[PDB]
Every structure is written in structure tokens, then in C-alpha cells.
Design a protein around this ligand. Structure first.
Ligand SMILES: O=c1[nH]c(-c2ccccc2F)cs1
Length: 125
């Protein structure tokens, strides 16, 4: 069974646009999205479709790149660090729900490396 997906808007949360957040969407997210290992992470985990009935018994703060993309598009974040935290949550969730060496973990490991390469240097404000 699936919980509601994470919010992509929140009217009482303040919005912001920064050069770094623009970069996270245009360069970081959009490039990672095209990687051959991106597909499992392009939408929230569907526990019914993927037959993972224990997924949300284990993962209590789900995150995916579809959600991140919508958050960036809606200027949901206050700063780049907040967005980076969502990417890190996504990767960590994968390591938590699975085990070292699993195919899905190998995919997350590769994406995390590419992610770190890309956020090593961000534009200046
Ligand atoms: O920890 C995660 N597993 C998956 C997944 C698992 C089985 C089949 C397809 C998937 F996207 C996405 S994230």
C-alpha cells in the first residue's frame, strides 16, 4: 500500500529562486535524469506496482527525482542545500531498503557519484 507522495507545494512554506537552485534543475537534475540508471528514481516508489509491500514499512521519508523536479519547478526550496538533502535522502533510502551489491544499489551508487561530481562546484549567488 502506498502513502501519499511527498508534497511538491506548500503555501505556508516560503519560496526562493537562486542561481544554485536554477543550476540544480537545469544541469544537475536534468543531466542525471538522462542516465541509463535513472529510471527507478524518476517517480515515487509504487509498492503495489513493484510488489514491494514492505517498502513503506521500512522507508519513512521517501524521495525521488520526479518529486525533486517538481519542487524545483515550483520554487519550493529555500536554498540549494535543501534540495541536495532530498537527493541524499533518495540515495540513502535505496541503501536502507536494499543490500550491498543489489542491482538497484549499484544503480544508486553510480548516480550518487555523478551527482557529487556535478554539485562539487555550484555557481556563485
Ligand atoms: O529502493 C528502490 N527499489 C526500486 C525498484 C525495485 C524493483 C523494481 C523497480 C524499482 F524501481 C526503486 S527504488
Amino acid at each position: 500500500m502506498n502513502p501519499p507522495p511527498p508534497e511538491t507545494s506548500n503555501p505556508n512554506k516560503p519560496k526562493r529562486q537562486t542561481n544554485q537552485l536554477q543550476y540544480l534543475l537545469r544541469v544537475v537534475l536534468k543531466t542525471l535524469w538522462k542516465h541509463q540508471f535513472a529510471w527507478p528514481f524518476q517517480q515515487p516508489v509504487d509498492a503495489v506496482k513493484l510488489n514491494l509491500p514492505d517498502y513503506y514499512k521500512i522507508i519513512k521519508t521517501p524521495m525521488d527525482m520526479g518529486t525533486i523536479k517538481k519542487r524545483l519547478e515550483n520554487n519550493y526550496y529555500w536554498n540549494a542545500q535543501e534540495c541536495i538533502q532530498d537527493f541524499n535522502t533518495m540515495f540513502t533510502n535505496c541503501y536502507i531498503y536494499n543490500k550491498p551489491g543489489d542491482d538497484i544499489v549499484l544503480m544508486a551508487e553510480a548516480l550518487e557519484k555523478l551527482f557529487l561530481q556535478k554539485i562539487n562546484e555550484l555557481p556563485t549567488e
